[PDB]
């Protein structure tokens, strides 16, 4: 009966979760953690990552 309102809530949380999940994406880089990239590479390639 109350599918529409719950759907809106369902979309909003899912969107935030997806955005949060996007922080765990390498995006074609060696790691998704900035601290690891700084701790492991020189600034010419760390800047690229």
């Amino acid at each position: 009966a109350l599918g529409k309102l719950q759907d809106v809530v369902n979309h909003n949380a899912q969107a935030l979760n997806t955005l949060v999940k996007q922080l765990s994406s390498k995006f074609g880089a060696i790691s998704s953690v900035l601290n690891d990239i700084l701790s492991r590479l020189d600034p010419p390639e760390a800047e690229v990552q």
Binding site: D42, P43, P44, A46, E47
Partner: protein, 49 residues
């Protein structure tokens, strides 16, 4: 300045090395040209320069 044959890679921005860290440091945003040429004829001696 004068350096070794193998140390010419260390005269670059963002490099980890001994002469890079403790002798001559380049900034990350460096613009310009590095010129390197052999000086065995002038900067070397048989007894050790």
């Amino acid at each position: 300045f004068v350096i070794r044959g193998n140390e010419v890679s260390q005269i670059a921005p963002g490099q980890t090395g001994n002469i890079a860290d403790y002798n001559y440091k380049l900034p990350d945003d460096f613009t310009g040209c590095v010129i390197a040429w052999n000086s065995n004829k002038l900067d070397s001696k048989v007894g050790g320069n």
